[model samples]
Target: HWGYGKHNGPEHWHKDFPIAKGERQSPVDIDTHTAKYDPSLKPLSVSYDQATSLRILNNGHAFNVEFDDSQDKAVLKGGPLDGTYRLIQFHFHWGSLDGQGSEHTVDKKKYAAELHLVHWNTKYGDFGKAVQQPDGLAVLGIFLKVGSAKPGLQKVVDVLDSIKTKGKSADFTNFDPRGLLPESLDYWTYPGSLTTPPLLECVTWIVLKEPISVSSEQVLKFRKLNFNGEGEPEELMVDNWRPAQPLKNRQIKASF
Candidate 1:
């Protein structure tokens, strides 16, 4: 990891890790920052198999999908994960190119894009019932950067051919969203809100420190998704992300 700093580092890693050369983002400029010196949080885990059950949906907003709750394999005892927080939806935030895509920025820096996996507490019986509770949801964020040509993410692109026409999504069965996660589970955790409309502040965001790679072509494909809203003629909706907010003195924890 020594030869992997700014200008001289691996281009993909540096580009996706933080907002810029001197930023404090994940996979950061290691020497410039020290790990958060806190020690109150515990590590959390969820089965990769369960995460794979994510289903694609066209909710007239963006090409979003629900993470099948019935298949979730994680458990919450009494805190944030105290109840049945079933996986609900998984979507993304991106930029037209590789420089800016993330929703949560630190000190005004942005990553390539962020993928959010949303879940709701099952204490109220279902997602609809749990919507009212302030602590009823959890979200996992995965950072993605445009990298050199790779054949890995074609599974996602393969399905685009089916939904390419707008408001149309065929079954993307036999696939697992886990395929998109970074190899290292080390992450940053904090309490945050939904980045989209109805900005609910009940989400516990677990963001991976390591990022994954997607080709520029794949990013271009993502830019093509549309929900046929407001006579928009299904133009490229690539900039489907919300901007970042202040930390508000809130603390963010890492699971190293």
Candidate 2:
């Protein structure tokens, strides 16, 4: 029930969710000059089947495109993962204005938005059970900049009109998330938690260095979404990102 608002924002989350103050918190600032370059890191391997995409839903927090993760049809391997991680869902975090929406920053520079592709380890059986274990999830973070409109993102943007209000959902299939990724697989890896509530410290964060481009018009569409339902006071669905957390003793690894 925690939200990114004035009263129940990230600052007060620790009062209810103890893990919010935990060591391996997410959205940490990635300083490339300090990150360790690991030559031993394997190439990131991603396989996504278009048929596995199930539906899109507006969960009041963000718009998520859920996948049919019942099978290993779409999985991410290599990079910093110990085993295969199946794709579960993907979502986006943005702000009301351009140039300041991303959760994770690069050298203190914030992007226009950020995208999270959520996955769970197959060894943990299911996402529910995986989340309780140490190596539960692997979230791929891709920053979005304001420039040319990404043709690959049109499919996802087109559906926003149908699910503009909270709790609304629509069938979203035949979409392969692989198209949204950058050509280079270079990324930063670290141990972190979910940016949202529960704040479980079981995620292995994989943040890409290269950001994809989106038009200013496309960015405005996300602001049109409402946090509350149709009949509510109409709170704009913007600035749904958590602030950067401390690095603590954890070291970020780079996969070149």
Candidate 3:
């Protein structure tokens, strides 16, 4: 809940969340030269049934698009996974300015923002149980570069006004998440954890090589969302991203 406040930043997270220093922590810097090419890695399969999108909420940290996870309505499989992983929610991490925001960097180059589509394995039950198993989650990371307005993300940012402060939400349905993905499914895969607190080591990261476009104005709209509640002093939500963790004992694979 501390999100990105100046006093309790990631540096203090390790003190509260010991797993923040776990062996398989995420958002590692993807060194292109060092990543090995793997022909066996299949293309990513993401099928977001239109009805799966339920509502949009500002959880104080970031605005997440919640989904219908009762069944296989929205599923993501075929990347670094053996079973179908159903979509639970999708959210973004961004910085205050243009050059910084993306958590996972490519050759030390950061993007304007990063998109995280979180999925949990069915074999381990729901998200609560899945988080305990090492192979329980698969999160698709799509980088957002500043460019012309991408229609999908524009629609999302347009709703920021309705949910401007913490705990605000609205009924958001049939918003096809597929519209947010880049043309190419090519990506870099690794075994890592969620970038934020409670930083459990259970996510199989699939970071796309191609970045989707987002207008600078659309990004500014995201900044307007507040971490503070309506009655509290105004505090904008920005720079809510964890820095890259060390890649120790884990290998990064490239599906080219």
Candidate 4:
């Protein structure tokens, strides 16, 4: 299986998944000076019902908060999207240490971590089907900074003990994902792919400009997670982020 290890990391992903070298790759460096500010971009509309949150799982790659996306319980619209997108799952990417884990960088500066709220276009019917189309997925990327502990994140961290190993899952409910977002929806939009394999080129990336706060202590908790299952030799699940890919003929739009 592919992992963040030297032998099976991002550099070698192209050997199996040819699309890894595709034009529209994710986690690109956002050069603010070069990004075009479009006044026409609409404000992001996010409606998340706390009840839509169903379970949280340790997927070895990262801890995922799976949502009940069967219906339009939680949907995202506007802000560069043609139609509504339903929330599927949300996860995080972090490093073993502070100040160097985010996949997307601004002015070449890396953050402590990053959060991804994965959604699929409702017009495509389902996530499995939507993921294959050009405008199928829409991911909201929020950067995490090391400073004050985020009270909103405490709900997620409280459950970490139950899912310390890979493949372990516990019921997580009544958690409002909206609480995790920053005050300003000011963001940058671009065409990109999933940061991990199979690196599909279907995502419409909406990355928030402002970062949410998390303490150094809270960030350390993520490093305690294991990539391996209960009995296997423990491998730390840190730096599970892909390196920034080439920009290649793409333009990033800013909604300032």
Error of 1 at 85 (Å): 2.6
**Model 1's TM-score against the true structure:** 0.75
- Model 2 accuracy (lDDT, Cα): 0.91
Local accuracy of candidate 3 as per-residue lDDT tens digits, 41-141: 98888887543788999988999999999988889889779998999999999999999999999999999999999999999878999999899999999
TM, every model: 0.75, 0.98, 0.98, 0.98
Q: Which whole-number lDDT from 0 to 100 does residue 124 have in model 4?
A: 92
RMSD of each: 10.0, 1.0, 1.0, 0.8
lDDT of each: 0.59, 0.91, 0.90, 0.93
Clashing pairs in 3: none
Error of 1 at 27 (Å): 18
Clashing pairs in 1: 76-81, 101-112
Clashes of each: 2, 0, 0, 0
- Model 1 lDDT tens row, 20-56: 2221122211211433634454555555464534446
Rank all candidate structures by their lDDT, best first, as comma-separated numbers: 4, 2, 3, 1
Q: At residue 128, what lDDT does model 2 achieve? A: 93
Candidate 2 clashes: the total is 0
* Candidate 2 lDDT, 60-168, residue by residue in tens: 9999999998888888999888899999999999998897999999999999999999999999898999999878999999999999999989898988999999999
Candidate 1 scores a C-alpha RMSD against the true structure in Å of 10.0
Candidate 4 error regions (>4 Å): none
